[PDB]
Design a protein around this ligand. Structure first.
Ligand SMILES: CCCCCCCCCCCCCCCCCC(=O)OC[C@H](COP(=O)([O-])OCC(O)COP(=O)([O-])OC[C@@H](COC(=O)CCCCCCCCCCCCCCCCC)OC(=O)CCCCCCCCCCCCCCCCC)OC(=O)CCCCCCCCCCCCCCCCC
Ligand code: SF4
Ligand code: SF4
Ligand code: SF4
Ligand code: SF4
Ligand code: FES
Ligand SMILES: [Mg+2]
Lengths: 125, 386, 176, 115, 208, 29, 97, 230, 112, 48
């Protein structure tokens, strides 16, 4: 009915991950920064979890880019920072978290472009 | 102790890569345990990693015997999630090529089953017709079997100017080939001894076990998705649904032959009723514009760029869409999260349930009876393993 | 609407019973099957004399890939990387830089023919008819490495097959 | 509290009992596996490999995780008994074709950028 | 609005809503939510303890005879506390209808196996266990079905890498096929295709 | 300003297509 | 084809049908491998005037599913998911095969 | 306090006086389409893309430059707003060159994305497009001025942020060109930023030309070391 | 009077009216043990009373078959047996009780 | 060509006995047809 387990959640032994990719990896939990080439903000809504970058080398034939770690393309998406922290904790990964960078509200005024005595007056349109 | 034997993967009657572990007393079968996953390529995760257009090619491959039907099922799901609608000519082309695909699958299923039973000649006779239908596929799309012709907005290209006439020429003669097959197989007493009262499944058990398609219709259940839940233009064509009475291999074989005849009927109706117009939905935000407009119009170039780089977004939601594929009810449960890549794509293939019920189907039978029962279930392992 | 396939009973009049007994004792239907096989024996076989004869194809056929040129000799490819982005198999690898004369051209255009699925999406996505799937299909190799095409191999393929590729495009570009 | 429901074992003791049952089963099966699969290892090698695999996750203190581990162990044992596994699957426990990765700082520094 | 837009069907929407209300009234102990999607698909979100009752009702009630189990799958959503979402799709031949049942579970909580209600689930549940790690309590024969023998991990998991962890090759020294850590000659190239502009205003979430 | 040319069935219709089974008697008593 | 008439008679008697009427091999009744160019009509939304996209936007009319019976929040006849399916008719074309 | 109550699609929010319609809308999560408005530059109001309908008001307003009045109900998804956005997008694409395959702004174009989201999908423009000659402003910023949409973002950035007044507009009507009017290099320690603010491929990076497409690149967040500002 | 009902494993039932009456009476008796406020009891009692009334008022098997909309009266008997078994199971389960547990805060929220 | 034969057997090629550098009396292959005759021979067109 209810055993009332009093242990911290830990599923590292059930996931089939080699211990090299559990004790050595360092995950990064963050809200991605806006692409400065565009003005849309729709890619800065959800939290993301990624892994540290590992070695990439040039494969002798065709000069392609080879890698040896399996978690190089793994990016997870979460609604909240607490959810990502819980996932990383229960999966055994050590994480670093960065707080969300929200742009502060500005004070825009069209009339300031034509100020009578202030420096904000524009010299062209 | 019962002798344990491995049937497949490298076996003539294993139908590809199926490992069957069977416990035999003598040649009696005590228990069949199918081992699958020898053709599991992780299609669903890969689909999760592609766009909606990029994932279309995977669908033909799930069942490589009736490739066009698979794309249509997927296309219907994406269209339902998109809340758009293909033009009438696209739908008529879809149904025509679906009937051609049903013909291909039935010929393959019936002939291979006969080959396993030991009747070699029928397979050779009908694969020339299969070659002609592959010619039709290649003419319409450029590939003999992996056309990727049916898209989630309609079809890719219009038919070449001399295709309907050739389809008519083939259809007006296919009946005699069917008749020769039936002459060699239907009334033969060896065939009846091999197939009658072998693998009998009751209607209630067939329903509970998840069977669909002929495996239902062979037990007397009056069910067909083209009649009860029609999708493209199937409510505008007339055909009959063959119904069995005994539930054995012989009834299912007769049902498949009659299904080929009815699909010839539907092909005739589609040939006579093909309408004019465009071939894909006239919405450049879903289907790519013509190559002539992409090179002259700025909006067309922008939409072509964004469709072939990012792909169209699909509004968030989950659907389960099923069609009456030649092997049974073929379904897809598609989950979208508002992105241009599907969040989840579960594929339901009737071969899964049929192979699951094979063990119940082969109770009290011999080894050759088990070979026959494997043949009669119309199993392809690309759709079983995914 | 539906029909039955195995719901007929035989008549039990003495003539029909005797006919059925004659069929059982004399193997009439087996003789009919033998006759059908014998009839197929005296027909003309549907076999073609490969390699001296070839099966039919169409202008839309997808075969070996090729990179095309303009009539002046300039390459059509501009390194827009649309084919690489659309490839379902991730078989295309592209690297580009400004040329010595300032043109936007590739320095690397690699196609893995063993990753490729020959779907033709690349020639659909291309906006300048640069990359095409040609008509050739007899290009089997004795080693895996020979199926890893670089830019030089694809350009040689284009130079070799242009005379037919242009005709095939001319016969089908109105359907696209 | 926590409103959690068990799989098989209510407490730690039942989980340990199931673990010991699984250990007995594997210990019994090892010689038959060595004979049937025609392995080139000794019975002692197989048994101490079983012990090592059991001890690899001896730090678990959650009865539910222990129950799931025992279930997976039963799955593997049933696969080995019925000869569903092949010789390659059995020898994949020994890593006979893998070079021993160094564990000290200096060798890792010499080899590459991977810590 | 006519040519390219999919047409709506109000009658089926009303029928499905009425039947969802009927089912929710009949089984208040387990039913948590009912939805009817705009393409006329009926979904019922229930509590994990009600998998056997609800399904049994939906299979046996005279007004709701769903004798066919079309599909049974799971969906992985890492951000939820209960990670996995179990989905049952049922088809009623008598009333020519389809219904969906949804429930939830985590990595360690088992779910009652529905082999007594539907034989078809027998393999389906196995598949779930193979690819998601969800344990089904009273399954007569639960084991891997699709993955390789002695395959560790559950591939259809969001944290599982696409190419896995091990790859196979024949080694001549030992004269067998061996598994070694995966090493790709060309790494899978990750594409960031998401547009930075909102596409559908109707699905906008409140910014809290 | 040319007309629209497309793959269409010929005016009227296509000829009838036989699909029913044709198994003669072809035997003595 | 080109078979001798005696061989034709032998084939017709052996098969029981007239093979000369329907041959599996194609000789000259197929379409020519070269065809005239097509014209391929445009479509419904190729108008210049009454063609604002917001009036033909299928993706933007999709809305989230209707929520009935949220748990958080008299006759009452029993209902079915749909009216019962009707019995199929027995194929006036060919009822028994 | 002194906050006023306004409505976005019938949803109540309280905003400071002097807040424009765009900021009030973005306080509820809705991003108004824009081309010439940059929150760190002075308001321009010329691209005309941010037009929205106020309830009971017959004329659409420029959301980037119109302060909200108390009680206004902004209708960001009304028929009038969508028609205004479609018309403005069509006018913007009337003279734009078909350069997307050769433009370095392929997957990062605000013009492309906003055409895909708020514009139409066809063209009824049967005339011939305009072409303007290219300018040379140094070895860092590459200019292809046919792609310009005359948003005057670079001019405002140079005037206010960079502090040099080299950039401007010459001519008028259709024949209005953004440039320097003389062979002058726009050289400044902040000269490169005009590449980022420019929403189209009119101004691009010259060292970066033709090397990559944005969907290919992996982005890693890091810290500058070239000075002590970090 | 009728042979070969059509479905495999379904046996043609002689005297089907008596069997149907017995099954419906048994269903009603089982439902009598369920609390009156339970919606399941009232709904299935209403449908069972309607079906029993239609069974009592039609002696012809074909006319009853058409009126029932039950699809091959043997199937009606099978459905009655299924409903009786479900009624016993539901009497054991007691699903008319209030909701056992409320889901977590964002369990069913999609997208993400 | 011989139009009296059925489709697939109405067009054929007799290969040369000596290609660029190798003797080809016995070892012929289908890759020796040049592209124009390749298009004609595969029934991709009606014109040589
Ligand atoms: C039996 C007696 C032998 C004569 C014989 O076979 O005639 C068959 C002769 C050919 O009929 P067919 O093959 O149906 O007609 C196809 C064209 O004639 C096809 O005619 P074709 O233009 O392709 O000419 C090919 C020609 C040249 O081909 C050859 O030289 C190679 C065949 C030599 C085989 C030894 O074949 C022959 O001249 C030799 C025929 C067989 C004689 C040996 O048919 C009969 O005369 C029937 C006679 C009674 C049979 C019952
Ligand atoms: S044919 Fe398809 S798989 Fe092959 S390179 Fe082109 S896009 Fe990629
Ligand atoms: S081949 Fe075509 S699509 Fe590919 S990069 Fe070159 S121009 Fe672009
Ligand atoms: S600026 Fe944008 S729309 Fe213009 S050509 Fe470049 S990518 Fe295309
Ligand atoms: S160059 Fe760019 S930033 Fe400057 S006015 Fe033109 S589009 Fe705007
Ligand atoms: S953003 Fe408001 S007019 Fe330009
Ligand atoms: Mg720019």
């Amino acid at each position: 009915q209810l055993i009332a387990v009093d242990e911290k959640l830990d599923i590292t032994t059930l996931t089939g991950v080699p211990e090299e990719h559990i004790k050595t990896r360092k995950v990064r939990i963050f809200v991605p920064a806006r692409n400065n080439m565009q003005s849309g903000v729709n890619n800065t809504k959800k939290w993301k979890m990624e892994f540290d970058t590992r070695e990439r080398w040039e494969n002798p034939l065709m000069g392609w880019s080879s890698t040896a770690d399996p978690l190089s393309n793994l990016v997870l998406t979460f609604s909240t920072k607490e959810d990502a922290v819980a996932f990383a904790e229960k999966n055994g990964w050590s994480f670093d978290v960065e707080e969300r960078k929200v742009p502060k509200p500005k004070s825009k005024s069209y009339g300031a472009n034509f100020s009578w005595n202030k420096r904000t007056r524009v010299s062209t349109k | 102790s019962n002798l344990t034997l491995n049937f497949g993967p490298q076996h003539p009657a294993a139908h590809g890569v199926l490992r069957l572990v069977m416990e035999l007393s003598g040649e009696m079968v005590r228990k069949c345990d199918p081992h699958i996953g020898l053709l599991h390529r992780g299609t669903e995760k890969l689909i999760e990693y592609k766009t909606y257009l990029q994932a279309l090619p995977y669908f033909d491959r799930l069942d490589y015997v009736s490739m066009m039907c698979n794309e249509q099922a997927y296309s219907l799901a994406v269209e339902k999630l998109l809340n758009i609608q293909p033009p009438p000519r696209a739908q008529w082309i879809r149904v025509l090529f679906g009937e051609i695909t049903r013909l291909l699958n039935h010929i393959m299923a019936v002939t291979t089953h006969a080959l396993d039973i030991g009747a070699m000649t029928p397979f050779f006779w009908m694969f020339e017709e299969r070659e002609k239908m592959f010619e039709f596929y290649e003419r319409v799309s450029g590939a003999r079997m992996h056309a990727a012709y049916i898209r989630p907005g309609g079809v890719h290209q219009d038919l070449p100017l001399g295709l309907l006439d050739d389809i008519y020429e083939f259809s007006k003669n296919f009946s005699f080939r069917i008749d020769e097959l039936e002459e060699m197989l239907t009334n033969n007493r060896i065939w009846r001894n091999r197939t009658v009262d072998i693998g009998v499944v009751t209607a209630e058990d067939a329903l509970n076990y998840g069977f669909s398609g002929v495996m239902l219709r062979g037990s007397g259940i009056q069910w067909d998705l083209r009649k009860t839940q029609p999708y493209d233009v199937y409510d505008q064509v007339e055909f009959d649904v063959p119904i069995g009475s005994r539930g054995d291999c012989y009834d299912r074989y007769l049902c498949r032959v009659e299904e080929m005849r009815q699909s010839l009927r539907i092909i005739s109706q589609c040939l006579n009723k093909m309408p004019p117009g465009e071939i894909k939905v006239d919405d450049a935000k879903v289907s790519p514009p013509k190559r002539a407009e992409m090179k002259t119009s700025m909006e067309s170039l922008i939409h072509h760029f964004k469709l072939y780089t990012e792909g169209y977004q699909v509004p968030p939601g989950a659907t389960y869409t099923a069609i009456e594929a030649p092997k049974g009810e073929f379904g897809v449960y598609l989950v979208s999260d508002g992105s241009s890549r599907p969040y989840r794509c579960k594929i339901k293939a009737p071969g899964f349930a049929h192979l699951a019920g094979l063990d119940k189907m082969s109770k009290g039978h011999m080894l050759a009876d088990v070979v026959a029962i494997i043949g009669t279930q119309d199993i392809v392992f690309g759709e079983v393993d995914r | 609407t539906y029909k039955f396939v195995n719901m007929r009973e035989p008549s039990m009049d003495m003539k029909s019973v005797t006919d059925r007994a004659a069929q059982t004792l004399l193997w009439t239907e087996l003789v009919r099957g033998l006759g059908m096989t014998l009839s197929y024996l005296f027909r003309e076989p549907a076999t073609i004399n490969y390699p001296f004869e070839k099966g039919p194809l169409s202008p839309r056929f997808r075969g070996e890939h090729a990179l095309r040129r303009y009539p002046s000799g300039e390459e059509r490819c501009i390194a827009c990387k649309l084919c690489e982005a659309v490839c379902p198999a991730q078989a295309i690898t592209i690297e580009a830089e400004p040329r010595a004369d300032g043109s936007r051209r590739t320095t690397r255009y690699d196609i893995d023919m063993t990753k490729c699925i020959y779907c033709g999406f690349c020639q659909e996505a291309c906006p300048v008819d640069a990359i095409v799937e040609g008509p050739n299909f007899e290009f089997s190799t004795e080693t895996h490495e020979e199926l890893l095409y670089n830019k030089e191999k694809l350009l040689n393929n284009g130079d070799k097959w242009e005379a037919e590729i242009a005709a095939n495009i001319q016969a089908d570009y109105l359907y696209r | 509290g926590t409103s959690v429901k068990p799989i098989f074992s209510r407490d730690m003791n039942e989980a340990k009992r199931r673990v010991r049952e699984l250990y007995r089963a594997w210990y019994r099966e090892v010689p038959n596996t060595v004979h049937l699969f025609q392995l080139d290892i000794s019975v002692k090698q197989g048994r101490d490999k079983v012990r090592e695999m059991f001890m690899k996750n001896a730090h678990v203190t959650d009865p539910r995780v222990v129950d799931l581990l025992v279930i997976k162990g039963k799955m593997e044992l049933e696969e080995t008994i019925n000869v569903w596994k092949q010789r390659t699957h059995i020898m994949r426990f020994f890593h006979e074709t893998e070079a021993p990765r160094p564990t000290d700082f200096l060798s890792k520094f010499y080899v590459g950028h991977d810590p | 609005t006519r040519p390219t837009i999919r047409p709506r069907n109000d009658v089926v929407h009303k029928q499905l809503s009425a039947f969802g209300q009927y089912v929710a009234e009949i089984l208040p102990k387990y039913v948590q939510q009912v939805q009817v999607s705009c393409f006329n698909e009926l979904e019922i979100f229930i509590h994990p303890d009600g998998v056997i009752p609800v399904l049994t009702f939906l299979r046996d009630h005279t007004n709701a005879q769903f004798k066919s189990l079309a599909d049974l799958t799971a969906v992985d959503v890492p951000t939820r506390q209960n990670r996995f979402e179990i989905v049952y799709n049922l088809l009623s031949l008598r009333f020519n209808s389809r219904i969906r049942v949804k429930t939830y579970t985590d990595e360690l909580t088992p779910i009652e196996s529905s082999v007594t209600v539907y034989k078809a689930a027998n393999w389906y549940e196995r598949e779930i266990w193979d690819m998601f790690g969800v344990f089904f309590a009273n399954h007569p024969d639960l084991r891997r079905i699709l993955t390789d023998y002695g395959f560790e991990g559950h591939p259809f998991r969001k944290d599982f890498p696409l190419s896995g962890y091990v790859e196979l090759r024949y080694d001549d020294e030992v004269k067998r096929v061996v598994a070694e850590p995966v090493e790709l000659a060309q790494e899978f190239r990750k594409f960031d295709l998401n547009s930075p502009w909102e596409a559908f205003p109707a699905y906008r979430q409140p910014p809290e | 300003a040319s007309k629209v040319k497309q793959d269409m069935p010929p005016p009227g219709g296509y000829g009838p297509i036989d699909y029913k089974r044709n198994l003669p008697r072809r035997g003595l008593s | 084809a080109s078979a001798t008439r005696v061989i034709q008679l032998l084939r017709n008697w052996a098969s029981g049908r007239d093979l000369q009427a329907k041959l599996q091999l194609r000789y000259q009744e197929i379409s020519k491998r070269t065809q005239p160019p097509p014209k391929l009509p445009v479509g419904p939304s190729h108008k210049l005037s009454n063609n604002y996209y917001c009036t033909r936007d299928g993706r933007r009319e999709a809305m989230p599913p209707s929520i009935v019976m949220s748990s958080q929040k008299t006759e009452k006849k029993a209902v079915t998911p749909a009216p019962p399916i009707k019995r199929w008719e027995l194929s006036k074309d060919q009822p028994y095969l | 306090s002194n906050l006023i109550e306004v409505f976005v699609d019938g949803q109540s929010v309280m905003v400071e006086p002097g807040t424009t319609v765009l900021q009030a809308c973005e306080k509820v999560g809705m991003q108004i389409p824009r081309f010439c408005y940059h929150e760190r530059l002075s308001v321009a109001g010329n691209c005309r893309m941010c037009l929205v309908e106020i309830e009971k008001a017959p004329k659409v307003v420029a959301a980037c430059a119109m302060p909200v009045m108390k009680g206004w109900n902004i209708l960001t998804n009304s028929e009038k707003s969508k028609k205004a956005r479609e018309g403005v997008m069509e006018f913007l694409l009337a003279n734009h060159p078909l350069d997307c395959p050769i433009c370095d702004q392929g997957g990062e174009c605000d013009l492309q994305d906003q055409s895909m989201m708020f514009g139409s999908d066809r063209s009824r423009f049967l005339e011939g497009k305009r072409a303007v000659e290219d300018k040379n402003i140094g070895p860092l910023v590459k200019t292809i001025m046919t792609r310009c949409i005359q948003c005057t973002r670079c001019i405002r950035f140079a005037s206010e942020i960079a502090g040099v007044d080299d950039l401007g507009t010459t001519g008028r009507g259709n024949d209005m060109q953004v440039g320097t009017y003389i062979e002058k290099m726009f050289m400044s320690e902040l000269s490169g930023n005009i590449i980022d603010i420019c929403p189209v491929g009119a101004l691009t990076s010259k060292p970066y030309a033709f090397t990559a497409r944005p969907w290919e690149t992996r982005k890693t967040e890091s810290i500058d070391v070239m000075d002590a500002v970090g | 009077l009728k042979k070969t009902t059509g479905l495999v494993g379904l046996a043609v039932c002689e005297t089907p009216h008596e069997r149907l009456k017995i099954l419906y009476t048994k269903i009603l008796d089982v439902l009598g043990q369920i609390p009156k406020n339970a919606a399941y009891r009232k709904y299935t009692e209403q449908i069972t009373n309607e079906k029993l009334g239609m069974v009592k008022a039609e002696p012809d098997v074909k006319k009853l078959e058409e009126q029932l909309q039950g699809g091959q009266i043997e199937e009606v008997i099978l459905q009655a047996e299924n409903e009786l078994s479900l009624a016993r199971k539901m009497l054991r389960w007691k699903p008319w009780e209030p909701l056992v547990e409320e889901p977590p805060a964002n369990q069913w929220k999609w997208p993400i | 060509e011989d139009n009296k034969q059925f489709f697939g057997r109405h067009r054929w090629v007799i290969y040369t006995t000596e290609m660029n550098g190798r003797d080809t009396f016995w070892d012929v292959d289908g890759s020796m047809v040049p592209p124009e005759w390749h298009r004609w021979l595969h029934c991709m067109t009606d014109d040589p």
